[PDB]
Design a binder for this molecule. Structure first.
Ligand SMILES: [Mg+2]
Ligand SMILES: [Zn+2]
Ligand SMILES: [Zn+2]
Ligand SMILES: [Zn+2]
Lengths: 57, 271, 1456, 101, 107
RNA sequence: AAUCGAGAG
DNA sequence: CGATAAGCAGATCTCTCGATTGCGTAT
């Protein structure tokens, strides 16, 4: 399940990239809270993961 | 990864109750550390979080094509005005509460919506563990490749690292004890690895190890030191053979040198 | 390796030799005749390559031993070559020996007495008689009878010398072979062969022998004697040679000269007494490897045949062809047949000979074949990186290892690894079952191969391997109940069963991330088994050592299998022992970014915590039930504030954390240090920049990156020093847990508010940027020397800018000047706008906070985000320019605008314009290219260094030496102290403050019964007194009445045996400050600390030095950096790219005299004084009028110190001679005032074809001279040759010196550096140059003139000042050890194959490179390597000699 | 026949006795080096794992390396270190004769 | 000790080693005007007598060949008149540990 | 098994 | 003999995938 970007270039439509979704709009908190993402790691919500966030085959 | 080269592996699936939550009630699905930005300097990701929040609030789409803003019309000002006109603040911060202690966090937290891509480099294609398995034929070392259940390689630099630590038994355990350790047989008399064989026994006798190089034919030599081959050619000769602990690539190197017409004599300690 | 199957024997050493044809046939199992391997129906053919006598093959029992494929080792076989073939390995030496003898007397063309002399010298060199070989050259001074007397005297002297050396113990019967005697033997043999090659006529018969020519291999042709040669031959009294005839020639020569060839072909005493024979150089019976080593591959249906089998079968086809064709010649000899068909069969026989020789050549080496994909030969199978040595001996694939991606885990101990449950069920460990193990080994067997902790296999006493994979619970229970049963078999009553239990939590693992640049990148970790994922979890403090980040990195995880490897990984390679790296003794572990930015918040004054918050933080970071406390009960502190309500502080949190981790009955740390955040960032009167500990209480300052992190003399480093590495590991783990639980309670974040400025800040920024409008135009006006304030559209400015564009050096000058100006503007903007122009300020401003704090980023990054990106630099210049003078299509040609040159006024907050975006992309691409080039080029240096240094270590004599015994240094760095223990030796204030804790850890009372305390101290006092009396004299004038104490007493056995630097510093400290710790007990403790800070015997110092010189080289007019390192240590180039001499100046020489001397020394060519030259050719026979127009006298006599007389002399002597030489060579190539009158006459007479000459002797302005050629001469340009001559002709040049520049004096002393090296030229200039301080750059030149030790000093200095510009701190012990390895033979040996030739171990060089050549030289000399270098033992499979192999272990059995 | 072996054995014993450094004049470090400590622990652990007699009180322990560490703490390891000089001459220090760290 | 102003002919170079045990050494008037042992980089070399040379060798259990080597043609070796086989003691000024004594052997 | 191409750190 | 101008030689981390691998011929 891809999504169209909220922030996109005007040329996103001109090449019809909506025919080929590439990602998903995610709620991203820039926060040092977990301790498990310092060098370059990132944390994904478990519940969002169980709701099909970023699923593929 | 975001659309700003902020790649990173997923380190934990944080449970939603333990996730921080905002005054609105929402809990972010992605957490990115603030320390990813000061050296990478991806301010586009900041302004994209700002514009994405404003767009998802006003039900609009914002364009991000470069060189539409300038230093007199800053995207920070633009999307901040759009955020202020909706009830959120100018700078995109939100009052969040710790999900473990329930207290409000020390400062407002920068949140927003950014577009995220899932790359094809899954961990299910990268993990590999070997205890024992198939080996190469001419070296008896583990085969190569994850798809064949083959071991990983301890190269020259890893060998130097093991020597630098002074860990001699570590180097032995890596390069010998768990790669191609074989208990070969060496003729004590001539010191050749591969000129020996097991003898074909008679009825009720026991096979022995005997050297071909250090044995003369029974015919040429005009009951204990007589041994037989499969062909029946009797021999009376070298029974001064022992057992050592060598690699197997050593034996292959011995064969490749014999093909060159070069002999190697190995002197054993107890004679 | 199974620890229950001991091996009694052991390979002591190996000896190289030749496999003779007789023994090959003696040991063989079958001869291979038909070049068919398999018949129809897929079966081997008898006599073929896959014969059953060569080993089992695809379910066929081997016919030699009668065992199946699994248990058949393989058996050798041979094929019979009809004609002897040249062994391609030995072809060069055989050819040399062939073209050195005389075909008549069958001796060498050299004199027999000289041959005997060389035989005697080599027989001496076979023993420890290195100097008798040179004492044998005096026997000459003291015809046939005289020569017999001389040879008898030489033999008598040699026998006497060898007998004496044997009898007095200087050598044994097996000889004394070392690197220096190997070098001398190699030199003697090389000169012997050269002397054999330098002959034209035999000295014992005078009869000329035909020459030989070499088209390559497989062939040899002898030129027939000349007419003049046969002329002398009779008075004395193209042709193709055959393999048998050359075998006969060399057999005769060797039979005659066996006496000298025995000592040429043996580097040790030939105790075998077996003769040296020529047929060893000839292959007549090839050996076929067993079918086991020649099996065919089967990749599904594609079943190709072995390439070795293919080459052997090609040899067999040629052999059968030549055998059959040999029977035809039998028909044309018994029967009288005309010699036509005899000619045909003879030509075909020659073809067969050459073809079989080429077949053997291609079977052994691909390159020695002929023809124009190829099947690799045996030499090709081992030669290179993809060969056999580097891919299957030095490196190997391994069992019980795993690989996965790494993810972070702050809740894992800093000395641990997070092991996924998927690995924990596949990795096992053999566990012998005892009476103390059955409790849990039985449970593992019941759990089975799936439920962790479980067991996958049971190894019985008799070696049976019962697998538990396919069994049920009741079966596993029966097996677990019969686990520890008493053995019924007598042969195995000493053994117990082994359980292959799963990897538990008490196991240790070896972790490694490629590329392994240093040993810290491979450490031991305690396995902690996790339940969820399939990645390895790593603590953050290991990222500094592994250079690892969690963005896709994967790293290996090796599981040691025996108790010895377990103990090594737990105690020697464990990660808590690697707190400091040996490169410079700096720490490599510590928390990184979120923990640093959390500590800045938690340890500020604004942090107060109620009783609940305080106790929760303390318990969360401590958790005493896991061994974290040292009191079994948490101890807290009274609150800072008692009323109105109890409030603690974060500094109190730190204090109680220390109080709970630091052991009791030991004082607290007393550290005074700083941190990265200035006091001005906290407001007026603050003192938070000054960290302070007192009795273990944090009382001032904030903990930072300077405290916990990769920082020296912080709290974690000081805790390390005072409490051991284990306590510092606990502190790192506890601090990581503390700042993590704190970061969830009070989160940390960054946003757009942190990136903004104020209205006043933006106003300042734009006002200062407005000043950058005219900077580019002013820089252009001043580089072009135009008047300032000239308009940007001035025609002269545009012209000069175009000249500057065309000329690269002028363009670089303009770029550098304008870059400096715009950098000044950038600095002004940044200083005015940060932090005084930022709306949100530290500590609230998180961007600024973590840039100041060292968590991540820097002031440059903050400046670019908030103020200015600044000038973009390509390599070291501005942006590239087109050929039209445009730097981009937008900018007009030759625009003097800073933005045009790449100076971007934009910032990453407000965004950058299109042109600025383009320039920034240029710079970013350049960086991305440079990083790849750098990582590509780094590693060859480290490999080459480590190959030779891999064996040198510390011996129990405390001297460091190579594994062959060759002493390299008598002391490690001259002091024997470990670099990883050197950090706090000189920290005397710290040691005095922590005296009581240091004394508690050192415990002199239990270390006195095995010590000597008086002698070393007395000698040290005497030597210090003498030095104080004599330390005002030059280094050469001093006497050595009292040597340094380390030279006499063992510093690890005699307290007080310390260095002169350490002792001087300690006494200066005790003198300058007096402080109740007694001044005697403090010196005693410092001496005991020195005694305990010594490098242990068995330390791989060579490996460590190579790693610490190579790994820092990743972070990289005169050559700089890695190219310089290549020049110094890799190449040892005598032809240094930029030779230089530093010339000190006497203090009484002024600047004007300095410049006068510089111009006097610097060279001037004729081209540097001539403006133009006019050539006026006339055909009125053909003549030239060459007019040379010079610069004015008042110009060149001032600038170059050149006079009219000197110029005229140069033109009269050298220029015209060179010009005429060039003219006559050109023609040869084409044929394919009476003083002036007398000067002209003399020039005409001396020179070839000059007809006029006049020099302006009154102005020094011109020089016109005619030049008349012949009429046959073709037209010449006569200007290109004149220019070439004028350039190549000097005026006043000192050899090897181009320029002498007087730079700005630095650090006081005034220097004078030339662009070349000529020591003796300035040896004369005593007046201007202090010759005693002339230090150069070329290591070879100083070796020539001053000696080995000055070369060693300059090696250290040059290999050090490369790291000085890169600000990379490398200790001088590594550089000194490398210098002493490079100058060990008294010369400048490089770290490469040519610089390693004279080494005792051949396996080391064979593994390194040119495996073929080093094997040929090893077998020709019958070298017997004793398996001492680390490479040799890895080849053979013996425990190494460095480290835990430096000794042996004996068991004290009670009863005899 | 056998007398050749007797001569070889005599020579081997004589060279061994010549290489050994007598206790009264060994000039090596009194302290046990880290490498020696690690190998003593590993070898003693191997011996315990192969059912050797143990000279310490097992506090219900199962790790052979931990048992060896306990023995080293109480100085009950019946082992001897044979330190090798570069020339092949050697000294013999018992485990209890050395001071750890 | 023999010296020569400009050059020494090859014809006169084959007699300097021709009369043992007397040793003849050759030098130039140029290339000598500066004493190399006065250069600060060149350390102090002291020729070691055989009595203490045997003591050094027995202390370190060495052969003569296993020492660091100084070339017979090394300028300091010519200065010292070093015969082959006799060791030279070098007092090296170390940046780390000050004065420590190193040893080379002429060979 | 090579060769080519795509990648990861 | 010898001093260059010239010729020839061997060098210049680890891991995961996929795709292809040889044409003419004489009987
Ligand atoms: Mg990485
Ligand atoms: Zn044999
Ligand atoms: Zn067989
Ligand atoms: Zn002759």
């Amino acid at each position: 399940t891809g999504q169209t970007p909220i922030v996109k270039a005007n040329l996103y439509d001109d090449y019809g990239m909506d025919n080929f979704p590439n990602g998903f709009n995610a709620v991203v908190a820039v926060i040092s809270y977990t301790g498990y993402d310092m060098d370059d790691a990132m944390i994904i919500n478990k519940s969002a993961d169980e709701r099909g966030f970023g699923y593929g085959t | 990864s975001s659309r700003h080269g902020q790649k990173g592996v997923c380190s934990r699936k944080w449970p939603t109750i333990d996730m921080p939550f905002s005054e609105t009630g929402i809990q972010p699905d992605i957490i990115i550390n603030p320390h990813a930005f000061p050296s990478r300097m991806t301010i586009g990701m900041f302004v994209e979080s700002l514009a994405g929040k404003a767009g998802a609030l006003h039900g609009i789409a914002q364009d991000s094509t470069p060189w539409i803003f300038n230093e007199d019309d800053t995207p920070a000002d633009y999307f901040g005005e759009q955020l202020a006109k909706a009830g959120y603040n100018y700078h995109g911060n939100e009052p969040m509460y710790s999900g473990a202690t329930g207290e409000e966090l020390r400062a407002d937290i920068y949140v927003g919506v950014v577009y995220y891509q899932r790359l094809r480099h899954m961990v299910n294609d990268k993990f590999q563990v070997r205890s024992t398995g198939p080996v190469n034929s001419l070296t008896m070392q583990p085969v190569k490749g994850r798809k064949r259940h083959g071991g990983i390689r301890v190269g020259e630099m890893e060998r130097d690292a093991l020597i630098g630590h002074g860990t001699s038994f570590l180097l032995q355990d890596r390069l010998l004890n768990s790669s191609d350790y074989t208990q070969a047989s060496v003729c004590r008399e001539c010191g050749s690895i591969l000129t020996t064989q097991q003898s074909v026994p008679r009825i009720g006798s026991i096979s022995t190890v005997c050297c071909r190089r250090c044995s003369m034919r029974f015919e040429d030599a005009k009951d204990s030191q007589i041994w037989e081959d499969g062909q029946g050619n009797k021999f009376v000769g070298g029974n001064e053979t022992t057992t050592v602990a060598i690699p197997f690539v050593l034996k292959y190197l011995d064969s490749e040198l014999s093909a060159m017409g070069i002999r190697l004599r190995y002197n054993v300690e107890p004679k | 390796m199974d620890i229950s199957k001991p091996v009694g024997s052991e390979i002591t050493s190996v000896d190289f030799g030749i496999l003779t044809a007789k023994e090959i046939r003696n040991l063989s199992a079958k001869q291979i005749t038909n070049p068919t391997v398999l018949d129809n129906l897929g079966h081997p053919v008898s006599g073929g390559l896959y014969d059953l006598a060569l080993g089992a093959f695809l379910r066929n029992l081997c016919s030699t031993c009668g065992l199946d494929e699994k248990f058949c080792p393989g058996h050798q076989g041979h094929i019979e070559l009809p004609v002897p073939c040249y062994n391609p390995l030995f072809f060069n030496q055989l050819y040399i020996y062939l073209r050195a003898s005389c075909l008549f007397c069958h001796h060498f063309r050299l004199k027999s007495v000289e041959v005997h002399r060389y035989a005697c010298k080599l027989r001496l060199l076979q023993y420890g008689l290195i100097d008798e070989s040179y004492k044998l050259d005096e026997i000459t001074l003291g015809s046939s009878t005289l020569l017999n007397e001389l040879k008898s005297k030489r033999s008598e002297y040699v026998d006497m010398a060898i007998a004496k050396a044997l009898s007095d113990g200087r050598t044994t019967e097996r000889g004394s072979f070392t690197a220096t005697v190997n070098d001398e033997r190699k030199k003697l043999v090389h000169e012997f062969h050269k002397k054999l090659l330098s002959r034209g006529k035999c000295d014992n018969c005078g009869m000329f022998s035909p020459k030989f020519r070499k088209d390559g291999f497989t062939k040899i042709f002898e030129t027939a004697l000349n007419e003049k040669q046969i002329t002398n031959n009779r008075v004395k009294g193209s042709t193709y040679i055959l393999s048998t005839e050359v075998k006969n020639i060399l057999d005769t020569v060797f039979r005659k000269e066996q006496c000298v060839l025995q000592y040429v072909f043996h580097s040790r005493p030939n105790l075998s007494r077996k003769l040296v024979k020529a047929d060893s150089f000839f292959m007549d019976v090839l050996v076929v490897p067993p079918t086991r080593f020649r099996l065919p591959s089967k990749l599904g249906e594609e079943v190709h045949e072995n390439s070795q089998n293919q080459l052997l079968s090609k040899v067999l086809t040629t052999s059968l062809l030549i055998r059959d064709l040999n029977d035809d010649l039998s028909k044309l000899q018994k029967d009288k047949v005309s010699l036509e068909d005899r000619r045909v069969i003879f030509s075909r026989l020659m073809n067969a000979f050459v073809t079989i020789q080429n077949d053997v050549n291609a079977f052994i080496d691909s390159t020695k074949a002929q023809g124009r994909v190829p099947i690799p030969g045996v030499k090709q199978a081992l030669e290179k990186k993809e060969g056999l040595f580097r891919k299957h001996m030095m490196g190997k694939r391994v069992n019980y290892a795993a690989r996965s991606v790494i993810s972070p885990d702050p809740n894992i101990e800093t000395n641990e690894i997070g092991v996924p449950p998927v690995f924990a069920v596949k990795l096992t460990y053999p566990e012998p079952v005892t009476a103390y193990n059955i409790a849990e080994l039985r449970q593992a067997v019941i759990n089975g191969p799936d439920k962790w902790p479980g067991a996958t296999q049971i190894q019985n006493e008799d070696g049976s391997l019962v697998s538990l994979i396919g069994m049920s619970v009741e079966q596993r229970k029966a097996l677990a109940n019969q686990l520890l049963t008493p053995s019924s078999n007598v042969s195995t009553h000493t053994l117990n069963k082994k359980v292959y239990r799963h990897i538990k939590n008490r196991d240790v693992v070896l972790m490694n991330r490629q590329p392994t640049l240093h040993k810290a990148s491979m450490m031991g970790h305690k396995v902690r088994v996790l339940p969820n994922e399939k990645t390895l979890r790593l603590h953050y403090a290991n990222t500094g050592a592994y250079n690892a980040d969690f963005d896709g990195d994967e790293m290996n995880m090796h599981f040691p299998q025996n108790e010895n490897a377990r103990a090594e990984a737990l105690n020697l390679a464990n990660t808590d022992s690697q707190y400091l790296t040996p490169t410079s003794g700096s720490p490599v572990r510590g928390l990184i970014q979120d923990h640093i930015s959390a500590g800045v918040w938690l340890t500020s004054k604004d942090s107060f915590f109620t009783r609940e918050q305080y106790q929760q933080y303390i318990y969360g970071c401590i958790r005493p039930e896991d061994g974290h406390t040292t009191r079994s009960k948490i101890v807290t502190l009274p609150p800072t504030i008692f009323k109105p309500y109890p409030l603690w502080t974060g500094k109190q949190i730190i204090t109680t954390v220390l109080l709970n981790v630091t052991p009791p009955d030991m004082p607290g740390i007393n550290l005074i240090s700083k941190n990265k955040i200035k006091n001005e960032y906290w407001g007026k009167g603050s003192l938070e920049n000054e960290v302070l500990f007192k009795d273990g209480a944090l009382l001032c300052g904030i903990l930072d990156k300077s405290q916990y992190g990769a920082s020296k003399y912080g709290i974690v480093h000081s805790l390390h020093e005072v409490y051991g590495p284990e306590v510092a590991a606990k502190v790192l783990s506890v601090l990581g847990r503390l700042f993590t639980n704190y970061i969830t309670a009070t989160a940390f974040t960054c946003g757009m508010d942190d990136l903004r400025l104020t209205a006043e800040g933006n106003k300042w920024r734009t006002d200062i940027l407005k000043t950058s409008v005219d900077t580019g135009r002013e820089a252009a006006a001043e580089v072009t020397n135009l008047d300032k304030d000239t308009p940007a559209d001035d025609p002269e400015l545009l012209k000069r800018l175009q000249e500057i564009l065309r000329d690269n050096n002028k363009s670089g000058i303009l770029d550098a000047v304008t870059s400096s100006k715009v950098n000044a503007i950038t600095s002004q903007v940044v200083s005015k706008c940060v932090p005084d122009g930022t709306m949100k300020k530290f500590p609230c401003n998180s961007m600024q906070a973590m840039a100041l704090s060292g968590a991540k980023g820097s002031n440059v990054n903050v400046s670019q985000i908030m103020c200015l990106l600044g000038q973009q630099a390509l390599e070291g210049r501005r942006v590239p320019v087109m050929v039209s003078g445009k730097t981009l299509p937008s900018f007009k040609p030759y625009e003097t605008d800073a933005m045009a040159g790449g100076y971007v006024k934009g910032r990453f907050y407000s965004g950058i314009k299109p042109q600025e975006y383009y320039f920034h992309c240029m710079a970013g691409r350049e960086g991305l290219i440079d990083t790849a080039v750098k990582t590509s080029r780094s590693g060859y240096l480290q490999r080459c260094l480590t190959k030779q240094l891999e064996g040198v270590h510390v011996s129990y004599d405390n001297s460091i030496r190579d594994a062959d015994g060759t002493l390299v240094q008598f002391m490690y760095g001259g002091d024997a102290i470990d670099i990883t223990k050197e950090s706090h030796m000189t920290q005397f204030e710290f040691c005095l403050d922590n005296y009581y804790a240091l004394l508690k850890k050192y415990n002199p009372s239990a270390l006195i019964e095995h010590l000597d305390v008086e002698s070393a101290l007395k000698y040290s006092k005497k030597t210090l007194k003498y030095r104080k009396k004599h330390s005002k004299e030059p280094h050469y004038k001093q006497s050595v009445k009292y040597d340094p104490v380390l030279a006499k007493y063992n510093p690890a056995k005699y307290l007080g045996s310390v260095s002169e630097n350490f002792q001087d510093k300690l006494e200066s400290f005790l003198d300058k400050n007096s402080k109740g710790v007694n001044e005697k007990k403090f010196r005693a403790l410092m001496q005991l600390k020195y005694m305990r800070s010594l490098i242990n015997p068995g330390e791989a110092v060579g490996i460590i030095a190579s790693q610490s010189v190579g790994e820092p080289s990743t972070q990289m007019n005169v050559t700089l950096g890695i190219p310089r390192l290549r020049e110094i240590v890799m190449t040892a180039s005598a032809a240094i790219k930029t030779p230089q001499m530093t010339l000190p100046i006497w203090n009484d020489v002024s600047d004007e005299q300095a410049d006068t001397f510089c111009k006097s020394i610097s060279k001037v060519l004729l081209s540097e004084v001539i403006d133009k030259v006019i050539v006026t050719e006339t055909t009125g026979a053909r003549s030239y009028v060459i007019h040379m127009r010079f610069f004015d006298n008042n110009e060149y006599s001032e600038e170059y110190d050149v006079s009219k007389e000197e110029l005229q002399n140069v033109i009269s002597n050298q220029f015209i001679h060179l010009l005429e030489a060039a003219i006559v060579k050109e023609i040869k190539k084409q044929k394919r005032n009476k003083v002036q009158r007398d000067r002209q006459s003399a020039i005409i007479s001396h020179h070839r074809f000059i007809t006029k000459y006049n020099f302006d002797d009154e102005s020094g302005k011109w020089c016109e001279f005619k030049l008349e050629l012949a009429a046959d001469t073709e037209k010449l340009l006569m200007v290109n040759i004149v220019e070439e001559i004028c350039r190549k002709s000097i005026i006043r040049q000192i050899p090897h010196i181009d320029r002498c520049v007087h730079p700005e004096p630095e650090n006081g002393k005034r220097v004078l550096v030339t662009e070349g090296v000529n020591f003796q030229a300035m040896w004369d200039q005593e007046a201007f140059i202090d010759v005693d301080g002339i230090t150069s750059n070329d290591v070879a030149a100083v070796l020539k003139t001053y000696g080995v030790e000055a070369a060693r000093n300059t090696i250290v200095n040059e290999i050090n000042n490369v790291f000085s510009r890169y600000a990379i701190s490398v200790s001088f012990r590594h550089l000194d050890l490398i210098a002493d390895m490079m100058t060990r033979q008294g010369t400048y040996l490089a770290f490469n194959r040519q610089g390693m030739e004279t080494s005792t171990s051949s396996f080391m060089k064979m593994s390194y490179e040119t495996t073929c050549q080093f094997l040929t030289k090893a077998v020709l000399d019958n070298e017997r390597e004793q398996l001492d270098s680390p490479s040799a033992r890895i080849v053979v499979g013996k425990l190494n000699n460095v480290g835990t192999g430096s000794f042996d272990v004996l068991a004290k059995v009670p009863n005899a | 026949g056998p007398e050749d072996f007797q001569q070889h054995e005599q020579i081997r014993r004589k060279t061994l006795k010549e290489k050994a450094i007598p206790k009264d004049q060994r000039a090596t470090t009194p302290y046990m080096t880290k490498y020696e400590r690690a190998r003593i622990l590993g070898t003693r652990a191997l011996q315990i794992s192969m059912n050797a007699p143990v000279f310490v009180d097992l506090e219900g322990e199962t790790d052979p390396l931990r048992i060896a560490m306990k023995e080293l703490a109480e100085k009950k390891i019946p082992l001897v270190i044979r330190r090798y000089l570069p020339d092949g001459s050697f000294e013999d220090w018992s485990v209890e004769e050395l001071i750890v760290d | 000790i023999f010296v020569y102003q400009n050059n020494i002919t090859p014809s006169a170079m084959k007699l300097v080693p021709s009369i043992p045990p007397a040793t003849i050494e050759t030098f130039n008037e140029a290339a000598l005007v500066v004493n190399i042992t006065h250069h600060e980089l060149v350390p102090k070399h002291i020729r070691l007598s055989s009595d203490e040379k045997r003591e050094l060798l027995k202390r370190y259990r060495l052969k003569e060949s296993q020492l660091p080597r100084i070339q017979r043609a090394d300028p300091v070796a010519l200065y010292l008149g070093l015969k082959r086989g006799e060791v030279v003691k070098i007092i090296r000024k170390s940046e780390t540990s000050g004065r420590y004594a190193s040893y080379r052997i002429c060979m």
